[PDB]
Symmetry: C3
């Protein structure tokens, strides 16, 4: 039937979050010890939500959690200079807040928190978290505005230096859907390089939600997007819409990059489970 939408926020929410080492000199965040992933756990909030994070550093080196776009005080900045990092074996409670749009007393329109954001390390290896980000400490954050369209499933694609989600070249990741599913994509970039993100057989609107608000929204519609370290955006597509089922490539479009394996599949299935030509 009609699209599902986000409820109003304003709830006070809590999660546990850990930083721990993974194989091969890699680091990630997790919701439980021994559960860490690259990228980290996806965090979703409704505008007005407050989130307290009970943070434990499991590692033998100082780490931090610094987030984009959300409201936080200087004590949640997650930086060395702000004394907000977390020592080895230590814990701290990071607090993220969130607000709805509205008229300022000066008569202007204050932008809400809503959008496609991310969190990552500001501390490991240098005071910009170069080592940490390189090792995999980063994760997506979605803040939704009341009435925002909710998807069937959400997937995070991170271009971190020459890799996707710190995976070895040519290893995807791949995401599955069924023709007609509403699929949300969160795209984040980290590290040294510019990239262009590209998706076969689909397009989105270049704007807050990734979708057009209606017939008056001028935003350019695009299948290809240039992005750079700490950039984040998102969007939703209806799997296979107008195109049909198939194995649909997404890849960085910088030629040496795609040539070198920054490539994935959006695997879109016929209602019966089959994918044509594959």
């Amino acid at each position: 039937g009609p699209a599902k939408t986000a409820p109003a926020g304003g709830e006070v929410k809590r999660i546990k979050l850990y930083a721990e080492r993974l194989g091969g000199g890699q680091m990630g965040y997790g919701l439980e010890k021994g559960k860490a992933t690259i990228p980290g756990p996806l965090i979703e909030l409704n505008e007005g939500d407050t989130l307290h994070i009970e943070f434990e550093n499991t590692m033998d080196v100082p780490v931090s959690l610094h987030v984009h776009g959300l409201d936080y005080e200087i004590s949640s900045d997650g930086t060395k200079q702000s004394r907000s990092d977390v020592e080895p074996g230590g814990t701290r409670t990071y607090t993220w807040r969130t607000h709805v749009p509205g008229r300022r007393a000066d008569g202007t329109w204050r932008a809400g928190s809503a959008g496609y954001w991310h969190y990552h390390d500001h501390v490991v290896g240098t005071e910009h978290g170069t080592g940490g980000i390189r090792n995999g400490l980063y994760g997506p954050v979605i803040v939704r505005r009341k009435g925002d369209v909710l998807p069937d499933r959400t997937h995070t694609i991170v271009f971190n230096d020459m890799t996707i989600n710190n995976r070895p070249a040519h290893t995807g990741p791949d995401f599955e859907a069924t023709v007609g599913d509403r699929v949300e994509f969160v795209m984040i970039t980290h590290g040294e390089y510019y990239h262009t993100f590209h998706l076969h057989g689909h397009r989105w609107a270049d704007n807050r939600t990734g979708m057009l608000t209606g017939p008056d929204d001028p935003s350019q519609v695009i299948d290809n997007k240039i992005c750079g370290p700490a950039d984040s955006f998102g969007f939703q597509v209806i799997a296979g819409e107008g195109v049909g089922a198939g194995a649909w490539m997404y890849h960085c479009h910088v030629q040496s990059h795609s040539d070198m394996g920054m490539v994935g599949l959006f695997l879109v299935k016929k209602p019966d489970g089959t994918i044509p030509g594959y």
Copy 2:
């Protein structure tokens, strides 16, 4: 005045050929021996369907892949979908197109209109690195009913360190007359980020490159950063507010402009003269 795009929905057909050009270059053409870089401009109205009859006249596999438009996986134009074209081979690629409208879930489905492009995916690699470098790319415009039509359209492709695969400092230059409504399609390919910059003129960063009205918040710019496979276009009024002259456009990356990615938008007085040129 201001002629506008009519409603789409027509079924259209063209023949398209891949062929070798001089110097190791390759290009698409509308007839054998007529291939160009960039390839032929393809224009469609929302709702239109285009059947492309493709012949690959080269001695290596080639393919046709498009951005933004509606194609089935069998028109993806990749080795992976088995949609490339063997040497001397022929295939029909089909591109469909749709107007915007309200989906069943009550969301607003975006139409196909916009500035897009097509290029090879199979030459030299499965990402068409070789083909793209050799020159297999071309502009596609899809127009929404009511879109403002230009007097002329020019395509500027920054391909690696070249414009339209031309030698340094060779242009292209485009001519117009003050007051002409001129459309530019701006495509980027290859290995490098760039910044497109046009003297004397400006456009809106949005679908049409023009402000829809007084309510459109889109930033107005003369400079745009663009990555490989990036696609955008706009229209300006030649010399509007600025008069006639040789109006430079180039990549604004300093070394690149010094290397010769530079061209002229030649805007003439009514008498055909250009002051300072």
Copy 3:
């Protein structure tokens, strides 16, 4: 906080003088007075419809020019060697910039006005694209405002020029001071060989003409992070410490090696008492 002051309507004929000087260490800069040159050059603000007459003197050993983005100039003000609009050593020229309001064209289309965040810089030094002039520091912000645009308390220009910020030594800032609640404006220009991503802690803006959402209608992405290449310019305004509070709020390019090597600054937001918590 009271109702914000706004830009009035333009149409005035304005005049300034601009000098091109050599500064310490092979640097070059514009100035409003001989001996007053700065990098970035002086801030130039116009209301849509205004006309600006720049009386330009070149005091350097080599030819220089003045070339501006986004505004209305005849070919003779282009500021290039090819248009014969550059300036010989010890020479002068009047450069003229014009600006127009938006409006309905005779053809039914809507003509965009001049308003926005723009910049000017040398086109002639070291190469015909002014690669030298720019590396040496010749560049400066231009702001064109639309009637009714919201005015800030203070304006700050952050230029990423190759690997510097405003041509400064690494890890030198600049830092900017505000008090919690100030409406603060940033103009952000990029120059040189390299792409960048501009990032500001604890604040966000709208990616659009004014950097602020016009109202609930506005679909524009809200961002704390923006990619920019050479000659890109954009601006925005924030309420200092809004919903966040006092602190020393980092801004920096987020390309990792760039921030590591020092393109970093502080937006220092004081409390009313003038203290900054934990700094």
